[model samples]
Target: GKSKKWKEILKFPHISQCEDLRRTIDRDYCSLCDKQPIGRLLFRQFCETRPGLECYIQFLDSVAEYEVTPDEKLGEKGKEIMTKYLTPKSPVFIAQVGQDLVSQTEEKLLQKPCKELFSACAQSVHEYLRGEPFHEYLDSMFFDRFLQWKWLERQPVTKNTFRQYRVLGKGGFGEVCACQVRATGKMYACKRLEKKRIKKRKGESMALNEKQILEKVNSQFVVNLAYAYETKDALCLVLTIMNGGDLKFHIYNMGNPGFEEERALFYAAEILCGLEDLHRENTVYRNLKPENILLDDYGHIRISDLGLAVKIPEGDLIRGRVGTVGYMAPEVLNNQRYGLSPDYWGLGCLIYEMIEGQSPFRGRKEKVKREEVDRRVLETEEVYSHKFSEEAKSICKMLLTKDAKQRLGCQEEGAAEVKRHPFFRNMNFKRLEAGMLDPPFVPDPRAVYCNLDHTDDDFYSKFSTGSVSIPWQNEMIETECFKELNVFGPNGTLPPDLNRNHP
Candidate 1:
């Protein structure tokens, strides 16, 4: 009866068979073993195994004496013991130690004695000796059964694969650089974000959030992530290179006071397509300024800088005070629970800027306080009111409505309702996303990659080498941080019942 139960408890084929033979031992020895306390029992087993186990037991006894005792180095000593016993070793030795340790653990579990010591000893051994067959067994029996399991592969591409060049730009997070892949000599824009700064801002989850969102998006009007890697201090996102500079570069640096109505319409239609796709994916793009909108090599626009974007499911709303001062919507400034309305408000500002070459609220030289800016957005006062065409001004008026419920795109049918408006009468959105429609302005390919005169020499000096540290690198790869975020599988689509109510 004892042998059968002990065999059943160990479960492993070899250990269960070993227990069958243990039944042949002296009944008195079995009785003594059973009667002894956990400490004494472990000591007896160690002594019983000839000189080989004796050496380990002596070392462990020393470690356990000071380590397990109520001493200053209680935790440190346990770690030291675990480190000493559990590292790379021969398969034979791992098998031996694994059998013995598990055998001792099995005995303690049956007896239910010294619960804390049993759990600590078992956990320490498991965590430290996480290699080969032992780890494989634990994964099958524990992690795979209880936790959100993912078989995420490590990023094959590393920073060393790229020969980093001059810094392209700098922002609050870190710097962006131009890099060429050594193998294929392909150019990519690498954005390095300081993990320390991100964590200091309590944005660890936000960093991973952006990565997950970028992974799901593949659009002509959005920059796609090529590769993402990390080092000790920063996280690096490798993205498709946009040779044509941002909208601000064309608007201010290229000596354009404003775009022609046709040109502005072309860009606005493309932006609308991007926003439509984002909205379909249940994402809110909070920041939609000229700086965040980049022109591709062919002069078409793609939305960039997605750090401020939020993944809000269809029925839900996001409450955060974010976005640039002038482009921010009134609802965003008031910090109210809002959905996709703010994005439409930003669209109106962007359209106005493209046509009028200035913010609709702020003057050509005027910069106001946050309170005043909020007032302008809330009150729906347009400084560039007379500058816009009748159709453009009417569309802007609908989009810039202060009440989120009455905003152009947030009405009954969402973005489709905005598409039916008079402003987009000449556009075919499907053909736009398919890249079939001709853009009003195709930038000169010869001048697309030219280094601008405004290159920040001091800021560009930081990323001379292709190395940056990422504090969350280990967590991002080893754990289920990305997978566990959205309860609905890999795709962004929500589960049936989950769409009802989260509260």
Candidate 2:
């Protein structure tokens, strides 16, 4: 009852009762992004460049994508999301935003009136986003840029901060438990889902593009989304807890027909350092197999599913035919238009099913048809089974190239050209991204491998966001541009009951 500062969390309230905090237009986040355009909604009091005041109340979403057309389909949906998010190679194209935001977005692209394109790029992208005078720091001599957004809008990682346990399995939309973290006695892997099965399988943008690309990934070879809250009917997340199971259960866990060339190069160099940290955060995992990778409890490897992830606006244009027709990628089964080269042909079908124990476009036990595994990944040119090893058939023939501009981590030094190939010449990868290498296989805490199963409280008191929990704690939350391994109750700032008003 005595901890809420920053001038009592910005004192005032009655902006004539929040017409979304006295309108600059958030119209309930542009009518809940119903293909946006309540005149480009923004009432963001401290969006700090509207990447969500913590992104429109933490992901209701809409930084760009306009349309109320009729001025020639609003100049063709403002040339598709405002000339595709300020193109001239956007990733927020700024080398001192030359061509000055493409000449103020081509003189406001279609004659300015989509509610005046947020005041015509408010002095060119809101004065380089309110010219960040170093994150208006909380106590660094108290300057206060949203004092870390009212200390993350007070105590927010619902589902009663973890301790839910069991039911360690299920698929795509719900259940996969093993929780515990009622204030850090950790162990995660929650991933709950089920918002009425994503609005009756309408796939609300693929479960909100897999919790917004699992909060723009941070690797230890991926799967590290510590916490992403939502619960009045599920949508949890809380990942990276793997208890030695999945790399498709060590490619069928046991006397496999494969594995042993330094155990498939330490599981293909930690799933190619978790698919090159989801292609340096512009993303495109487009599903890689080995049941989306897993295998933690220190036998390392994280890379979990981001539902079929995507989002590449840096080297642009990605489109989808989507994955797993035996790790797709003949430019994603010739529907073409790629990047991150269809997950390096799904890391050459997970390094040929960890050195040929099954996938090289599957069907060893027949009964196929993912259209005969995407026509054996397009006209079956495979041919390399005698347990590869001429440097694993030259790094799986330069990552199964069918010319994604001659693939292999789709070049320009991505995954450092498959870690300077020669089959990762005794790799280190910064001593395996500094967890200081060990993972050759480590999960045996009196091994059960997974599925100890459990789920009762009369089937979890029928949802108020509880029931789907766990994960020790490594902290993360401060958003808008990457932080690192979150859960938020520690150095991800404020949550130890919203910091006794900070420290």
Candidate 3:
């Protein structure tokens, strides 16, 4: 942190006695343009790291009595080097400063406190910020300072080897894309999200929330967040992409309605494993539609997309409306406080959809008049069409219970009840842990990787769009900050003799 004296000194108030140049009429342009504070921080780090800077600081301390000009060539070579590197990259600090400037000016500029100056700067800066050419200006002048970091960070992830692909599915706030690592030629499903949209819809930032939730969950059944990165427009999460797509895609594609009843239950059991783990962590997978359950290579189900996944601590229940429309449990849809039982209700609806090849209580006729329809589904036990085995319907009935308290089993006990069901009579629960069973489906690795070339140019454009454009001048500037730093020594300092090794 800079001292109060330093801050006051660095204020650069334009009328300061520090440097008298031919006055070109300069004022603080915009709050967003306030980069000096952040630059000082970065410079602090550079000085601490570079031995040359450390020496320069010492020399300057000793020479305090001597007069120095504003253009005095102190550390001139080092400054030139640092300026080259750090000048062009886009920085979070710059972005933050710029954003604050825009917001403050937008709101207060129209008010009575020096309205004339505010109006001129406000309108000019707003137009400048909004226009494309101005961005090019910043890219050349200020924004490139941050881009250097982005360029270095993107090196490994780029290249044609890691083929790009498309979104398998999309929803209101997020999308699921299929991709593969070119190194191994293995396919993966990448889940993408818009940070602003999530904050807008759920009153929470789903990307940050998802990151928080994923960091805590580390189990085989739970899909993992492989890594996380950011670009100008969006923050991305790279995860182990599921191959066979979502379970709903399976049901939608499969021709025979009741043929995969056992398979559906098997996937349900896998989902139970995921739900149980989530509950143990005091989290709720509110969006439990088949649309959310993706299958990995070998057709094994991997539960994911925590955007709608609510995480409450052990002692609490989320008192919010959550879960998909048709798949929600009666208790959840009523807006009553609920725990994680709604996931089980969705599991039931998902299984029914698997067997029926369509949503059970949906279509034009059932869509009209929500209260009446919900009442009919919740109250009527006899209306459950016996399309499949009696055991399947029994599982559905218990899962669809209107009272959450009476719902056959929540995540804690759901697996046991599901295992005992006749549908899973031949299933071996223990084998799941041992990984004995293999999924029948696997993504075509070549198709996932090579087919990307012909798919669309946009398939690979994400990398380019997010590409960092670091200016060379900024790089040189940052490099200069490092050039002054010295290596360490045995006595907590760099060795005095350059050739000799010292502790």
CA lDDT of each candidate? Answer: 0.61, 0.58, 0.52
1-503, model 3: which lDDT tens digit per residue?
22224222222222122122213213232322323333233333344444433333332222231112122343333233223321335221122124545455335423423212223333443454344433343323122222222223234443332345887666556676766544333454555666455445643345556766765675567776544544333445556566556676666655354336666667777777787777777787888877677776676887877777768867667777766566667777678778778877777777777776666676423446666556655675523555657888888777776777767666466556666877667665655644666654555544342122343234224322322112112222333321322222455342332212341
Residue 431 deviation, candidate 1, in Å?
Answer: 2.3
Q: Is candidate 2 or candidate 3 better by TM-score?
A: 3
TM-score of 2: 0.32
Clashes of 3: 54
TM-score for candidate 1: 0.57
Find the 10 residues in a row with the least total lDDT in model 3: 9-18
How far in Å is the alpha carbon of 458 misplaced in model 2? 42
**Candidate 1 runs further than 4 Å off:** 1-155, 383-387, 445-503
The true-versus-predicted C-alpha distance at residue 92 of model 1, in Å, is: 66
Which should have the higher TM-score, number 1 or number 3?
1
Top TM-score: which candidate number? 1
Provide the global lDDT of candidate 2 against the true structure.
0.58
